[model samples]
Target: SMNPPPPETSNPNKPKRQTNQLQYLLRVVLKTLWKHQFAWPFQQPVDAVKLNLPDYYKIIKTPMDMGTIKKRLENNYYWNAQECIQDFNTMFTNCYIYNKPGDDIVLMAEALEKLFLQKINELPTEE
Candidate 1:
């Protein structure tokens, strides 16, 4: 019989590394929720559910562009509903932030993660 691969193990020396990664991920998620300035027209209240690791990774990989991200962060982010759509379209090919219908929470969360990554990239590193 073929031998099975060894299970992955965490580094004893860097116990907090994994925890830190998770914390960072959680921050990304929370920031998304806080920044979802726009609200959708729903008959019922939306539920706050967690994003799967795969989806989270995919979203962070292709976040909104800088211009869109900045505009989104502006005070008057949600002034013009029409402009909102145009901006989203310009940023994403589908023009639909939510990949699926009735998934605003997920889309907003995704946009936040992307924006977070972009912001981190632009930060100057300390020597």
Candidate 2:
């Protein structure tokens, strides 16, 4: 008996090769950001009552967070990596908006932002 060509196991159920690959690498950077020590602030949405950030939702016009980005990815809402990166920036921008310049939360946000950009750079931009 002869074996088939592995039954096309690498089946791309959706999207083009470039996009699929992009999502692949995008995940790498995403997990890296999620695992960062300073990732706590950006992990989830700012709970107004629990976190005592009552004005967070009021001040942050376009609130974003790491978990939001992850959910979008799971929902296949992004067409490209650029869209994902934009969400990350939006998350950081929101943090900067609600927190003061010298605040520890701001420092944490900046640190995670720097790591995101750094890891994103390592990913292949194109085929």
Pairs of residues at least 3 apart in sequence or in different chains that clash in candidate 1: none
Q: Give the least accurate 10-residue stretch of model 2, judged by summed lDDT.
A: 1-10
- Tens digits of per-residue lDDT for model 1 on 1-127? 1222221222334222223323332344224434455322111112112223344323433333434323343323333333333433443433244366547645654565466556444433322
Total clashes, candidate 1? 0
Whole-model lDDT values for every prediction: 0.36, 0.69
Candidate 2 lDDT over residue span 1-127, tens digit each: 2211211112236452337535754478778888888887777766666766666666776777777777666666665777677788888887777778979989888888888778777767554
What TM-score fits each model? Answer: 0.24, 0.77
Error of 2 at 12 (Å): 19
| Model 2 pairs in collision | none
